């Protein structure tokens, strides 16, 4: 989707010229009555790499925040501020645990995603190492809901679609664990 909208950056600066777009800032903070919370600082590749561990850790808080939105009946962004702050802290907790427990395995996986158009199918080997490291240290298992456990695509032995280019670091790190862990 590359449709031009009025809510984000468009395709080119000729679109801005025709629309006379002004990129507007607001120097005011959130009002002091609302409690503060530190935002999530991870970018696209780390967040996609950590997506299924944030889901397996913040499932109760994610559902509660979304259920607040449904019960808000239009008054959404105001009535679920407290629930939203829980979601942000829980997601930051997972990213914090990744950088202390599985730092090399985590940074390996999202460096492959950056190398591979952010497609999960291109980085199975680094993902497998990260899944093994996270499960041992945080007891988090990636699960794709709605399907049997043995038909999950990330556990497929012989996938039809495979990356054309191989991430060299992932190949090296996969060999090292093969000869040292699965003797």
């Amino acid at each position: 989707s590359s449709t031009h909208t009025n809510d984000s950056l468009n395709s080119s600066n000729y679109v801005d010229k025709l629309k006379d777009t002004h990129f507007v800032f607001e120097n005011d903070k959130l009002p002091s009555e609302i409690p503060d919370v530190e935002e999530v600082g991870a970018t696209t590749a780390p967040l996609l790499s950590a997506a299924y561990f944030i889901g397996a850790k913040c499932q109760d808080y994610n559902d509660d925040f979304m259920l607040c939105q449904k019960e808000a009946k239009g008054n959404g962004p105001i009535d679920c501020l407290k629930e939203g702050r829980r979601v942000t802290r829980c997601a930051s907790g997972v990213l914090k645990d990744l950088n202390t427990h599985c730092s090399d395995e985590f940074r390996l996986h999202w460096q492959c995603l950056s190398f591979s158009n952010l497609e999960y199918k291109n980085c199975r080997k680094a993902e497998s190492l990260l899944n093994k490291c996270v499960f041992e240290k945080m007891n988090l298992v990636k699960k794709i809901p709605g399907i049997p456990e043995d038909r999950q695509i990330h556990l497929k032995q012989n996938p039809v679609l495979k990356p054309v280019a191989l991430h060299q670091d992932s190949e090296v790190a996969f060999k090292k664990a093969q000869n040292e862990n699965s003797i």
């Binding site: 989707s1 590359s2 190398f115 158009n117 679609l161 054309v164």
Partner: protein, 353 residues
Amino acid sequence: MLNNLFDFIEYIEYWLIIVAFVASVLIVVAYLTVAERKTMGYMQRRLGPNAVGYYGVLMAVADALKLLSKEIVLPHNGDIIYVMSGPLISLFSVLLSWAVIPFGPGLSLLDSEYSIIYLLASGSIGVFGTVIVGWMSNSKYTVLATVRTTAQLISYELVLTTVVFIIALIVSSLNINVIIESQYNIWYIIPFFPLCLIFFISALAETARPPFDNVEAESELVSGHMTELSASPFVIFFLSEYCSMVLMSTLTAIFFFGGYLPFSNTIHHLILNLFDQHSIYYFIIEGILLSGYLAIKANFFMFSFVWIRAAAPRLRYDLLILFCWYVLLPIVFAIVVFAPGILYCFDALPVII
């Protein structure tokens, strides 16, 4: 200097990327004119151009420079609008069509979910620019050629558009890069071998190449729409026609032979394992490798354009109309119904991913 010099290159870097992109396409187009005569020459048991530059490598340069040093024929100096507007529309159309051709993953100037439509839409403008030459002209051979261009356009436009739509339907996407990456496990030449022939037949008719060279039929209309064109207006039309041959050859390689995907996955990994991925040299080699795969497949179809010219006689355009409307259209519209039925029967309707 230093810092200002270094970050000025960053300010101009993408323009050089485009200049290198333009230069790369013009080199293939220039040496396709040489390769056609060499290929026809040996098939005809002659040599072809080997006296202009070392082994004939400057023949394309000589043809352009000689034609660029020729007088332009027109009634008045202010009548440039007549015989220059047509060549420019034809050239701008085919050159803009190259904006969506990916030399590698994400290496296209334009990437969008409607790249397929842009490709078909851009080339349709070139058809318009050709007919403008016979703009109430007093040259009867130019006028006779304009009629034949419209007749050929009606023939191939429906078939060529529908064939590309079937390929887009199989992947459920109109992005050219997605279509290439969808051919990892299978090249569409195997499931759609009939469509590859039809696409190439349509390409020959679109480019006015033999056996469909009824527009520029020398034995019939001296030079067709080019009979009154000399010097620069003739180069631009000649340049655009050979640009279209390279484009349609590259599209045949993209729609049916996997685009830039390697012939052998094992060999592709072996070659790339020699270079450290933390060095910029890996990405140079990969760019050469992936474009080489595209170049090899496109070279074969550029060879096939020359090959069919040296083997088959010309077919009258009124027979081409009957061939496209009574034979090709019924077959292609059968496959546009065949293909979704097969996929639904086996629960394999495509999605974008």
